[PDB]
Amino acid sequence: RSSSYSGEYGSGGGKRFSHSGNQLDGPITALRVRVNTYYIVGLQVRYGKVWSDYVGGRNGDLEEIFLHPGESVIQVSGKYKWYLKKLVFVTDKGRYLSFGKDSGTSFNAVPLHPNTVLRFISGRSGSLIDAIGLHWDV
Ligand SMILES: [Cl-]
């Protein structure tokens, strides 16, 4: 069994979401994160050439980062309070894809099993991102 799960990081408000179906579209190839003065407001993840359904709220500015072909996320750190505040996606090409404000309770997620990478995310959302979980696999 190579799959593992890190989380859930954050709190209990909002509604649950999961990108479990999306990994069939492809590897993660891009990230959209909506950010405001204090929080991570929303998330979208591109699986192959297909963006996930948008989750979270509308009160923030959209930031977008494309991963290079064949680049994988191998660690995710972040910060929260009652809501998510910071995410850093660490890649196997040595990049640190950072979003949000450097404040709050710290977390540091790494995969349990050998040569696994981030395959999808889940969490909770409303008008903000309440919580996040990371799903690792081959
Ligand atoms: Cl699309």
From Swiss-Prot:
Top-level taxon of origin: Eukaryota
Cell compartments where the protein resides: Secreted, Extracellular space, Extracellular matrix; Zymogen granule lumen; Golgi apparatus lumen
Keyword terms: Cytoplasmic vesicle, Extracellular matrix, Golgi apparatus, Lectin, Protein transport, Secreted, Signal, Transport
GO MF term list: carbohydrate binding; peptidoglycan binding
Listed GO biological process terms: defense response to Gram-positive bacterium; protein transport; suppression of symbiont entry into host
Span of domain Jacalin-type lectin: 3-138
Keyword Transport: yes
Distribution of this protein across tissues and organs: Highly expressed in liver. Detected at lower levels in colon, ileum and jejunum.
Record-level GO cellular component terms: collagen-containing extracellular matrix; Golgi lumen; mucus layer; zymogen granule membrane
Main location, first listed in the record: secreted
Coiled-coil region list: none
UniProt similarity note: Belongs to the jacalin lectin family.
Protein role: May play a role in protein trafficking. May act as a linker molecule between the submembranous matrix on the luminal side of zymogen granule membrane (ZGM) and aggregated secretory proteins during granule formation in the TGN.
Protein name per its UniProtKB record: Zymogen granule membrane protein 16
Lineage: Eukaryota, Metazoa, Chordata, Craniata, Vertebrata
Gene that this sequence comes from: ZG16
